[PDB]
Amino acid sequence: ATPVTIYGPPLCTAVSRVLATLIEKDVPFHLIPIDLSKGEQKKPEYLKIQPFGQVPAFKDESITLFESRAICRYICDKYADKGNKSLYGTDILSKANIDQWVETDGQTFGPPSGDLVHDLLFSSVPVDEALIKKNVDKLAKVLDIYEQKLGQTRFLAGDEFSFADLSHLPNGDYLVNSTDKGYLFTSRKNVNRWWTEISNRESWKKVLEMRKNA
Amino acid sequence: ATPVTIYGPPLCTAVSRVLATLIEKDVPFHLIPIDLSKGEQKKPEYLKIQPFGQVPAFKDESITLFESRAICRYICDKYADKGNKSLYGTDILSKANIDQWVETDGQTFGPPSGDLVHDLLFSSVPVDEALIKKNVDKLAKVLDIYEQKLGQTRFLAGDEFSFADLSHLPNGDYLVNSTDKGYLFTSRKNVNRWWTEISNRESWKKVLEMRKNA
Ligand SMILES: *SC[C@H](NC(=O)CC[C@H](N)C(=O)O)C(=O)NCC(=O)O
Ligand SMILES: *SC[C@H](NC(=O)CC[C@H](N)C(=O)O)C(=O)NCC(=O)O
């Protein structure tokens, strides 16, 4: 197989999402750097690839894709028979059952957690501590619902790790390990169990190792 | 087959997304009301169906699902042979090509446009004109990119209507028809062409009618 091409730095949450997915699916890849600190993602040449001037972007022999969850769904389809076969289900029901919790990442967990990560770690503008308080409360109410769900099932969608869990890793990791908001996860028993299990998965450990080696 | 069951009011954008998809896919359904003006979505029996206390929810003979886009992917999957057969593509590549624009709805267009609709039409608290402007500016930037894309293809993902276009209808229609931010769409000639084209589909007209008879 020819390695697929991924654009962007591993430190980027949306890039990490794709990388963890590739590793779970045993898909070889080649990572092309895009230096966000130098604004390289806004260069006309890159905009030909990702028209919104964001990373990641994905290329293989057949298609160019953007939006990390779309990239991941394609990887899971194309390589269904490979690696972790059950990551995004094995049939129409199991896929949909996982998918609703992927959408919960995208629409519910993702916005407050992502804004927290951005405002605390990746913004050059002074932290509006009111806006922080708003999003912490937002995220706490979400995790209170996760707490009940995770008292019924080991992972969000059922008994096995799925792409719905994987998709929480990038924002979760920055909050737990690079901000003082980790207690939102670790003070909730079932959420803490879940977070501890998913963050210690070998694929995610491999992504963290990639960040370490630049 | 048996009709599927959908929960919530058609005035809800996320419910509207599901309804338009059901109609495109020629799927029979029962719509069960949930009055948001009276807190019905928070009653314990409904929380058993939708753990976030939001609408829509979906049930058929095999599964209960929430999150409108997951509900719609399931419908397109289960009823692929029915109705509009190409709505979410017909193989792995055409599906992924559409899906990236569906994610653009979910992560890029959706948040600022949805926030505008909320702050302008469905919020008790006085509008913060600075936050209004922040989101107008975000959405302008997104639609500048749409304008370029829609000068190359008739719809977002190509020359045929897809779920990616469908998913924009709920927030688009509120902005265009119930706010003074419609110029965002109508001032851009290709976006305006596209908007007119998708919002005049019978499926969308039917959803707007259901609203009236609600
Ligand atoms: S992580 C760096 C930023 N990327 C994204 O936010 C990608 C978001 C998409 N919704 C996705 O693929 O999931 C980024 O590119 N920031 C630079 C910028 O100029 O925005
Ligand atoms: S449209 C009314 C509200 N629902 C949603 O926002 C659903 C969003 C999901 N991400 C989706 O299914 O797409 C709603 O239910 N408001 C009531 C409330 O108490 O929040």
Nearest CA among A72, A154, A152, A172 for reference residue A112: A172
Percent helix, strand and coil across chain B, each to the nearest 5: 60, 5, 35
Q: What Å resolution does this PDB entry report?
A: 1.8
Does domain B90-208 fall into CATH 3.60.20.10? no
Q: How far apart are CA B105 and CA B88, in angstroms?
A: 14
With 0-12 CB in 10 A as exposed, 13-18 as middle and 19+ as buried, what is B159?
Answer: exposed
Give the determination technique.
Answer: X-ray
In the chain, the amino acid numbered A67 is E
Strands in B29-32's sheet, in edge-to-edge order, are B29-32, B4-7, B57-59, B64-66
Say whether B63 and A102 touch across the interface (CB within 8 A): no
In a mutagenesis test of the B interface, which of A67, A104, A148 is the best target, namely the one with the most B β-carbons within 10 Å? Answer: A67
- Count CB atoms within 10 A of the CB of residue B21: 28
For the Cβ of B169 lying below 6 angstroms from any atom of ligand 2, the answer is: no
**Mind telling me how many Å the CA of B106 is from chain A's nearest CA?**
7
Q: State phi, psi for B25 to the nearest 5 degrees.
A: -90, 0
Interchain proximity A100–B65, CB inside 8 Å: yes
Provide the token pair at A25.
């699916």
Residue ranges of chain B whose CB lies within 8 Å of a chain A CB: 51-52, 62-63, 65-71, 73-74, 77-78, 92-93, 95-97, 99-100, 102-104, 106-108, 111, 142, 145, 148-149
Listed residue (A50, B199, B148, A164) closest to A42, CA to CA: A50
Could you report how far apart the first and last alpha carbons of chain B are, in Å?
A: 27
Alpha-helical segments (H) within chain A: 13-24, 44-47, 68-78, 92-104, 110-121, 129-149, 163-167, 169-178, 183-186, 189-199, 202-212
Phi, psi values for residue B19, rounded to 5°: -60, -45
Q: CA dihedral defined by A163, A166, A168, A170, rounded to 10 degrees?
A: -140
- The torsion of the CA quartet A187, A193, A195, A200, rounded to 10 degrees, works out to 130
Q: Which residue of B has its CA nearest to A150?
A: B51
> Strands A29-32 and A4-7: what pairing?
parallel
Rounded Cα distance between B128 and B119, Å, is 8
> What is the C-alpha separation between A111 and A142, in angstroms, rounded?
11
Interface test with A, best of B55, B107, B109, B142 (most A CBs within 10 A): B107
- The CA–CA distances, whole Å, from A214 to A19, A170, A209, B88, B157 equal 14, 17, 9, 38, 35
* DSSP class of A145: H
Q: Which of A196, A160, A188 is nearest to A84 (CA)?
A: A160
Distance CA B75, CA B15 (A): 14
How far, CA to CA in Å, does A163 sit from each of A23, A80, A103, B61, B212?
A: 12, 13, 11, 25, 39
CA-CA distances (angstroms) from residue A23 to A27, A65, A79, A82, A201?
A: 6, 18, 12, 11, 11
The answer to whether B25 and B80 have CB atoms below 8 angstroms apart is no
B83 backbone φψ class: left, alpha, beta (φ>0; ψ -120 to 50)? left
Domain B3-89 fold: Glutaredoxin (3.40.30)
CB-nearest to B63 from A68, A96, A104 is A96
Q: Facing residues of A31 across strands?
A: A6
Instruction: Report the distance separating Cα B22 and Cα B25, nearest Å.
Output: 5
Handedness of CA A187, A155, A26, A7 (dihedral sign): negative
User: Bridge partners of A87?
Assistant: A89
Each domain of chain A, given as residue ranges in start order, spans 3-89, 90-208
DSSP-derived letter for residue B42 is: G
* Two structure tokens written together for A153: 């099932």
**How many beta carbons lie within 10 A of that of residue A125, not counting itself?**
6
Name the residue facing B149 among A51, A95, A99 (closest C-beta).
Answer: A51
Q: Distance between CA atoms of A214 and A211, rounded to whole angstroms?
A: 5
The reply to whether B90-208 shares the fold of B3-89 is: no
